A paper describes a structure:
The cholesterol-dependent cytolysin (CDC), pneumolysin is a virulence factor of the human pathogen Streptococcus pneumoniae (pneumococcus)2, the leading cause of bacterial pneumonia and a major agent of meningitis and septicaemia as well as debilitating diseases such as otitis media, septic arthritis, keratitis and sinusitis. A central feature of the toxin is the formation of transmembrane pores in cholesterol-containing membranes, which lyse or disrupt cell functioning, depending on the concentration. Pneumolysin and other CDCs bind to mammalian membranes through a tryptophan-rich loop and a threonine-leucine pair within a membrane-binding domain at the base of the toxin. Once bound to the membrane, monomers then oligomerise to form a pre-pore complex that subsequently undergoes a complex set of structural transitions to form a transmembrane pore, typically comprising 30–50 subunits.
In this work, we have determined the structure of pneumolysin at 1.98 Å resolution. The best crystals were obtained from protein containing substitutions Asp385Asn and Cys432Ala. The asymmetric unit contained a single molecule having the characteristic four domain structure of a CDC, with three non-contiguous domains (domains 1–3) linked to the C-terminal membrane-binding domain via the strap-like domain 2. The tryptophan-rich loop, projects from the base of domain 4 in the structure of full-length pneumolysin, reflecting the likely membrane-binding conformation. Notably, two of the tryptophan residues, Trp433 and Trp435, shown previously to be important for membrane binding and cell lysis, project outwards, so are in position to allow interactions with a lipid bilayer. In the structure of full-length pneumolysin, domain 4 is offset by ~30° relative to the plane of the long axis of domains 1–3, such that the toxin resembles a bend rod from the side. A striking feature of pneumolysin crystals, is that monomers pack side-by-side in the crystal lattice, resembling the molecular packing of the pre-pore complex. The interface between pneumolysin molecules is created by the concave face of one monomer packing against the convex face of its neighbour. Intermolecular contacts are made by all four domains, but mostly involve domains 1 and 4. Although most of the residues at the interface are polar, there are relatively few polar intermolecular interactions: salt bridges between Asp8 and Arg226 and Glu434 and Arg399 and hydrogen bonds between the side-chain of Asn339 and the carbonyl group of Pro87, and between the hydroxyl group of Tyr461 and the amine and carbonyl groups of His407.
Author numbering: 1 to 293, 298 to 471
Write the structure that this text describes.
């Protein structure tokens, strides 16, 4: 009857593949800015570059504790509200649907549910009954691990993070209290980590006919009621992943290039030994977190809190059905995956710190010695151009005897450090002999160049203490 018209009507729905779900964020064009600022202990080089991030994915992350709309097999509009992950459901009258669940220990036939009139309470009711039986049958006498998924990203802008984690991330992100300002100023580095623990997945298998999803009751072709066209078409929820998920902000004041490594070591089981750079970074890291799966909670504190956050809910048991943490949609017409294409431009701030240092000289040789020590001071002008300003030790070329000592302060902007040391041999037609000569000397924390011995046999030590 009218459903035979629905089959071919939906099959006649002509809509643009991959394009109707495409959205793009804010835009900006390539502009070079590179500055160098002398902080009292470090020279800091900040480099900003236009970057783009694009994602194309099937999974939609759930941020709402109470679903109301995100039950499996729900039909949602393909609309502005869908892209922004705040969908609008069209509810009138639904036909029965079969579902499947991937729990281990379930005999094949028992993995299938048959729901009469699909709704939130309906489907969740079925699933919860099934689970109640499964926890006693299998769950409490077996050790079943949840499936674990990590995603992570360095934070630069809220739009970037929206593209990464979903268009409805902003509320959660606001709860994480992300200091984008300090990332832009080069004073902080921030990583966002999404951790998902999947207990089970309720999925809908292939739909033979597009009409099978419907009874025959009311407004069958008249379903053009409110905006259901080849321009504003329908989707159904192909699957919903249930479990627990955590959004984790790791925010450090370190300017080090070992931040990501330390964060990675932290997320894993690795315990970090003291007096390490990792240990210092993690000491200076603030942790914020949003836990889901009676609602979403905001916890805060130090790095040690991460372990627990990750271990909790690792084994699926009763006392919690888990909440929908993800869902995946497929178009009515065919097996078509509904992939969401998002992209945005963002400003990437890169920071490089150059530790200040000291060059110490000790002369205890039985000879006249001369030093020739030169370097460049690095600056960036207002056009971001590299400028090198030549500098020299003020006692260059002067005759020095034992026991001479000095300390030469070298800020982090020092480049092209050259040290040459020679001694007067007292020999006719070989008046000078080079004791030491190096160029491009690394600006370590503490370098001590000592010379001793005699005119004939001068000796030298180049001692590096970079701690």
């Amino acid at each position: 009857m009218a459903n035979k018209a629905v089959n071919d009507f939906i099959l006649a729905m002509n809509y643009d593949k991959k394009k109707l779900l495409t959205h793009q964020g804010e835009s900006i064009e390539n502009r070079f800015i590179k500055e160098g600022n002398q902080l009292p202990d470090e020279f800091v080089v900040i480099e900003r570059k236009k970057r783009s991030l694009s994602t194309n994915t099937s999974d939609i992350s759930v941020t709402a504790t109470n679903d109301s709309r995100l039950y499996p097999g729900a039909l949602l509009v393909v609309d502005e509200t869908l892209l922004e992950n705040n969908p609008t459901l069209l509810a009138v009258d639904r036909a029965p649907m079969t579902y499947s669940i991937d729990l281990p220990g379930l005999a094949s036939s028992d993995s299938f549910l048959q729901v009469e009139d699909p709704s939130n309470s309906s489907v969740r009711g079925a699933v919860n009954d099934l689970l109640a039986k499964w926890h006693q049958d299998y769950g409490q006498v077996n050790n079943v691990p949840a499936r674990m998924q990590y995603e992570k990203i360095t934070a630069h802008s809220m739009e970037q993070l929206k593209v990464k984690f979903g268009s409805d991330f902003e509320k959660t992100g606001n709860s994480l209290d992300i200091d984008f300002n300090s990332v832009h100023s080069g004073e902080k580095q921030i990583q966002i980590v999404n951790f998902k623990q999947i207990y089970y997945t309720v999925s809908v298998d292939a739909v033979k006919n597009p009409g099978d999803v419907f009874q025959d009751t009311v407004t069958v072709e008249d379903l053009k009621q409110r905006g259901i066209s080849a321009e504003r078409p329908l989707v159904y929820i192909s699957s919903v992943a249930y479990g627990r998920q955590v959004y984790l902000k790791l925010e450090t004041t370190s300017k080090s290039d070992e931040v990501e490594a330390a964060f990675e070591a932290l997320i894993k089981g690795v315990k970090v030994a003291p007096q390490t750079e990792w240990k210092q970074i993690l000491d200076n890291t603030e942790v914020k977190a949003v836990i889901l799966g009676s609602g979403a909670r905001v916890v805060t504190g130090k790095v040690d809190m991460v372990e627990d956050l990750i271990q909790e809910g690792s084994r699926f048991t009763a006392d919690h059905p888990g909440l929908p943490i993800s869902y995946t949609t497929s178009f009515l017409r065919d097996n078509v995956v509904a992939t969401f294409q998002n992209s945005t431009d963002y400003v990437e701030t890169k920071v490089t710190a150059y530790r200040n240092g000291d060059l110490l000289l000790d002369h205890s040789g039985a000879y006249v010695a001369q030093y020739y020590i030169t370097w460049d001071e690095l600056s960036y002008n207002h056009q971001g151009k590299e400028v090198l300003t030549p500098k020299a030790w003020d006692r260059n070329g002067q005759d020095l005897t034992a026991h001479f000592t000095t300390s030469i302060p070298l800020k982090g902007n020092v480049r092209n450090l050259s040290v040459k040391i020679r001694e007067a041999t007292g020999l006719a037609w070989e008046w000078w002999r080079t004791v030491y000569e190096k160029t491009d000397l690394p600006l370590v924390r503490k370098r001590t160049i000592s010379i001793w011995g005699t005119t004939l046999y001068p000796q030298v030590e180049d001692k590096v203490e970079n701690d």
